Amino acid sequence: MRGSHHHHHHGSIEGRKEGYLVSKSTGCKYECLKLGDNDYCLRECKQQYGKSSGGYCYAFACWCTHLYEQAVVWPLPNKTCN
């Protein structure tokens, strides 16, 4: 009846800032059809990162909020992923 002594933090790069839902598997992200007419941005940021993490259909593309430090985004202009 003891333990529960662990940690899930790697790096002192504090930020807790929003970011794309782009993963490492594929490596890309296509802007949804309508601007706020779907939940593809949330469902993608539900199991991936967490439940508390949400997201909407921003102007550019699926902009997720409340992301951890592990979350990875696609640092690129308004073009197709490399």
From Swiss-Prot:
Cite the entry's keywords alphabetically.
Amidation, Disulfide bond, Ion channel impairing toxin, Neurotoxin, Secreted, Toxin, Voltage-gated sodium channel impairing toxin
Q: Where in the cell is it found?
A: Secreted
Primary localization class, coarse: secreted
- Residues forming the LCN-type CS-alpha/beta domain are 17-82
- Please report the PTM annotation for this entry: C-terminal amidation increases its affinity for sodium channels.
Q: Which GO terms describe its biological process?
A: defense response
- Matches recorded under SUPFAM superfamilies: Scorpion toxin-like
UniProt-listed CDD domains: neurotoxins_LC_scorpion
Q: Which PROSITE patterns match?
A: LCN_CSAB
Q: Which residues carry this modification: Asparagine amide?
A: N82
Question: Per the record, GO CC terms?
Answer: extracellular space
Q: Which GO terms describe its molecular function?
A: sodium channel inhibitor activity; toxin activity
- Highest taxon above the source species: Eukaryota
Q: Which Cys-Cys disulphide bridges does the record give?
A: C28-C81, C32-C57, C41-C62, C45-C64
Q: Which family does it belong to?
A: Belongs to the long (4 C-C) scorpion toxin superfamily. Sodium channel inhibitor family. Beta subfamily.
Domain remarks in the entry? Has the structural arrangement of an alpha-helix connected to antiparallel beta-sheets by disulfide bonds (CS-alpha/beta).
Q: What else is known?
A: Is the most abundant and deadly toxin from the venom of C.s.suffusus. Negative results: does not show inhibition of peak current on Nav1.1, Nav1.2, Nav1.3, Nav1.4, Nav1.5 and Nav1.7 (at 280 nM).
Purpose: Beta toxin that binds site-4 of sodium channels (Nav) and reduces peak current (observed on Nav1.6/SCN8A (IC(50)=307 nM)), shifts the voltage of activation toward more negative potentials (observed on Nav1.6, Nav1.1 (weak), Nav1.2 (weak), and Nav1.7 (weak)), and induces resurgent currents at negative voltages following brief and strong depolarizations (observed on Nav1.6, Nav1.1 (weak), and Nav1.7 (weak)). A reduction of peak current of Nav1.5/SCN7A has been observed in another study (IC(50)=35-40 nM). This toxin is only active on mammals. It has been shown to bind phospholipids.
> What is the official name of this protein in its record?
Beta-mammal toxin Css2
Q: Which organism is it from?
A: Centruroides suffusus (Durango bark scorpion)
